[PDB]
Design an enzyme around this catalytic site. Structure first.
Site, PDB file in Angstrom:
ATOM      1  N   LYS A  43      33.890  41.161  75.267  1.00  0.00           N
ATOM      2  CA  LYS A  43      33.647  42.426  74.599  1.00  0.00           C
ATOM      3  C   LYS A  43      34.803  43.390  74.842  1.00  0.00           C
ATOM      4  O   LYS A  43      35.702  43.130  75.648  1.00  0.00           O
ATOM      5  CB  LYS A  43      32.320  42.988  75.107  1.00  0.00           C
ATOM      6  CG  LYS A  43      31.120  42.095  74.845  1.00  0.00           C
ATOM      7  CD  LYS A  43      29.818  42.732  75.363  1.00  0.00           C
ATOM      8  CE  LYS A  43      28.593  41.972  74.885  1.00  0.00           C
ATOM      9  NZ  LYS A  43      27.330  42.544  75.409  1.00  0.00           N
ATOM     10  N   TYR A  99      24.241  40.321  65.254  1.00  0.00           N
ATOM     11  CA  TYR A  99      23.045  40.866  65.874  1.00  0.00           C
ATOM     12  C   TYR A  99      21.872  40.927  64.905  1.00  0.00           C
ATOM     13  O   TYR A  99      21.022  41.807  65.019  1.00  0.00           O
ATOM     14  CB  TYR A  99      23.345  42.253  66.444  1.00  0.00           C
ATOM     15  CG  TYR A  99      24.215  42.259  67.691  1.00  0.00           C
ATOM     16  CD1 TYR A  99      23.839  41.555  68.828  1.00  0.00           C
ATOM     17  CD2 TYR A  99      25.389  43.004  67.744  1.00  0.00           C
ATOM     18  CE1 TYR A  99      24.624  41.570  69.980  1.00  0.00           C
ATOM     19  CE2 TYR A  99      26.170  43.034  68.893  1.00  0.00           C
ATOM     20  CZ  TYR A  99      25.783  42.308  70.005  1.00  0.00           C
ATOM     21  OH  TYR A  99      26.563  42.320  71.145  1.00  0.00           O
ATOM     22  N   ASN A 147      28.694  45.218  79.609  1.00  0.00           N
ATOM     23  CA  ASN A 147      28.444  44.032  80.425  1.00  0.00           C
ATOM     24  C   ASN A 147      29.403  42.893  80.104  1.00  0.00           C
ATOM     25  O   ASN A 147      29.086  41.722  80.351  1.00  0.00           O
ATOM     26  CB  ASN A 147      26.977  43.601  80.391  1.00  0.00           C
ATOM     27  CG  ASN A 147      26.538  43.089  79.060  1.00  0.00           C
ATOM     28  OD1 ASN A 147      27.310  43.049  78.118  1.00  0.00           O
ATOM     29  ND2 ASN A 147      25.280  42.670  78.983  1.00  0.00           N
ATOM     30  N   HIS A 155      29.544  38.324  75.916  1.00  0.00           N
ATOM     31  CA  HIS A 155      28.400  37.766  75.216  1.00  0.00           C
ATOM     32  C   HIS A 155      28.467  36.247  75.288  1.00  0.00           C
ATOM     33  O   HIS A 155      29.550  35.669  75.188  1.00  0.00           O
ATOM     34  CB  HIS A 155      28.451  38.134  73.728  1.00  0.00           C
ATOM     35  CG  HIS A 155      27.580  37.271  72.890  1.00  0.00           C
ATOM     36  ND1 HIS A 155      26.275  37.598  72.599  1.00  0.00           N
ATOM     37  CD2 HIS A 155      27.805  36.060  72.323  1.00  0.00           C
ATOM     38  CE1 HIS A 155      25.739  36.631  71.871  1.00  0.00           C
ATOM     39  NE2 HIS A 155      26.649  35.691  71.688  1.00  0.00           N
ATOM     40  N   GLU A 189      26.454  31.307  65.702  1.00  0.00           N
ATOM     41  CA  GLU A 189      27.510  32.218  66.123  1.00  0.00           C
ATOM     42  C   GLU A 189      28.889  31.592  65.971  1.00  0.00           C
ATOM     43  O   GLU A 189      29.839  32.271  65.560  1.00  0.00           O
ATOM     44  CB  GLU A 189      27.257  32.677  67.562  1.00  0.00           C
ATOM     45  CG  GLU A 189      26.027  33.542  67.687  1.00  0.00           C
ATOM     46  CD  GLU A 189      25.627  33.837  69.114  1.00  0.00           C
ATOM     47  OE1 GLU A 189      26.305  33.361  70.055  1.00  0.00           O
ATOM     48  OE2 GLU A 189      24.620  34.569  69.286  1.00  0.00           O
TER      49      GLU A 189
END
Ligand SMILES: [Cl-]
Lengths: 149, 149, 149, 150, 156, 149
Positions: B10, B50, B112, B115, B126
């Site tokens: 990310k 998402y 965080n 992913h 994905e």
């Protein structure tokens, strides 16, 4: 004024599974990843990449060794073309200085883990050969004020 | 029998300049890099990424945090989907186990670092969303005999 | 015969969160931490620290960049004044040798992570400027017999 | 295609400072093969033979004393490994050694300089034989050879 | 966009014990907390003495193990204050159980230590203990207020 | 009160060239190297080492994978038999806890990098099997006062 250099992890860097360590060395100086792509190098692209060596006796063996997975990269920073060359070390790892990539990881020139552009002219040419224009990403590092004068 | 998972660093992983460290954690287990590319994520692709959260009030925040440079990756290994989830740790870094990426690097779920696919079906979806088939590279690791039973 | 040098992590070292890595490089040689204090440097103390540069065109910018959190340190070891200078590398990171702090972490002299005393006279002066005598701690390293001949 | 073998020995300071693994990792990192490895306690008798070139010099007794203790005997194999290991160790005097070398990165003084390596082909043969029995040298091939060697 | 939301942050007192100093792992310990984007708010090397250790370990007053604990702790120490979200409980989790043999792999005590009496590091057990310990070991002017430049990528 | 355990780096640890990293994990806790020897494991010694599995169908394959270079080791410390087992993690890397050797390096039980004794009785038997008495070295760590209560 920053510039951009073309750095390529060769198949020995992939196969020895030191990709992350290589990337970390450049990130450690605040160099910005402007482009990154895993591909498998082919003879036709490698012949263009190594055009300066056309007709030389060692070229076929060089192309064979490079025919494999590679990580194409563009890093951006102050004087990054010359600095990345210093970080990689001598082409022959036995001659390379401790603290350089080739000295720290390698034994012989034919498996010397990484390629970097030798000049501004070559970096422009190599970046164009291996990347499409849309694959070069423009963004600013959050720590820029603490990296640049 | 190996599988492939989609892992994406990310913008916080890019900006904190820990890309190499992240990659090294997966290479350390003999997971193979099957695909890698740096891009800047767009709202259009992120809405599809998402899609399971469509219509939920937190979705725009997920998209805004992710609108920036990302490193798209595919890693291959035995049970790699579930194992990469274990290596990343709990979504909330404060609940993640020491030695996981999120516990070692992070404080809060919205930053965080990484992913990873949840399951076999989400990995397939994905990988297809973020990579073209020609970007997936097939090769064998030289140390395969010492990684796999 | 050991001596002591003044080393100071500059605000870029604090903000890039490499304090521990810097300290580890000196600990690695068996240099002893004799004093350590985090403070926020002020122009008044910085002008005294950099008094040799009063009147020089670069001083205002140097003071501005140094007005921030700094980690003041005193390390003890054989020849530690000259040796720490060697470990930091050239003031200009681009000229610094591979394996030095500035070559490994930095790009430009104005953000070069760390200061160290340049001589016995400057070390004595700098230690006295940033630390009171009661802040200098005397103890013996447990591994002394294996560090010193 | 031609590899050689050198004798490398972690001195008692390397053992006591508990940096054995780090030292080994530096040589493994270049694809050098561990051909032999054992822990022993060096005795004055073997040290006098190891350091026979310094016989009669005033520093020899103190050198033997500092070396009387646990050591890790090692043989590493690679291209030009005798000279390459010397480059990686750095100057005998740590203050003169280049950053990135073992002595510069870990040490302060020549008398506690963490590691020994053979200085020549003849010395490597002599030192390997001195410290290791033939059956302690192991022959095998590294699986990564195709990506280490031309 | 990328800017962080406001969060309340805590400050915890962390102290590297004489074993951490003497084993020369100070930098490694600091790096573990820096790695999460915790901010160094204060840092000072001192030599701990029995009188200050008795106040630090006031909850153990009169207990039979206190004298030996004070003896172990009489030596150089690195006093530290780290700031972050939930940092008091998180730092305790990162240190691991008091007994290194019970501590989880990846914690400081499991990775570096063998026995409780040499377990490398102390950290506050609560907000109230952190306030009291910081006041004991630091003067008010030694606590430094500044903002981390990476805040938008550390905090959600 | 300290004890000694038998730890053995298997051929995959040798071939992946992670010997130093493994040793460093045990040195990091102040465990003392009491013995160390590189050998090539033979089926004769491996059958005795794995005597508890005599007659079980997996034993021949286990012996085959273990026939290669190995690093025999004895480490000494408080509770070191159980603690080394905890540091290695579960025999099956996928079940092993993050931060353990098997979780950090491995994928499958048949290539799980390292062996450690499971009990005091097994450690005494295994040390005797793989080492001669004169190969066990007795010395004291200078850091003892800071490792042990
Ligand atoms: Cl060469």
């Amino acid at each position: 004024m920053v510039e951009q250099t073309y750095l390529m992890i060769k198949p020995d860097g992939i196969q020895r599974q030191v990709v992350g360590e290589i990337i970390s060395r450049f990130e450690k100086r605040g160099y910005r990843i402007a482009a990154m792509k895993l591909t498998i190098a082919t003879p036709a692209i490698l012949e263009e990449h190594y055009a300066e060596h056309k007709g030389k006796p060692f070229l076929p063996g060089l192309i064979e060794k490079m025919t494999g997975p590679v990580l194409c990269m563009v890093f951006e920073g102050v004087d990054v073309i010359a600095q990345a060359r210093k970080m990689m070390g001598s082409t022959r790892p036995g001659e390379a200085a401790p603290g350089t990539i080739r000295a720290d990881f390698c034994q012989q020139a034919g498996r010397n883990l990484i390629h970097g552009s030798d000049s501004a002219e070559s970096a422009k040419r190599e970046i164009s050969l291996w990347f499409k224009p849309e694959e070069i990403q423009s963004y600013k590092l959050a720590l820029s004020d603490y990296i640049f004068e």
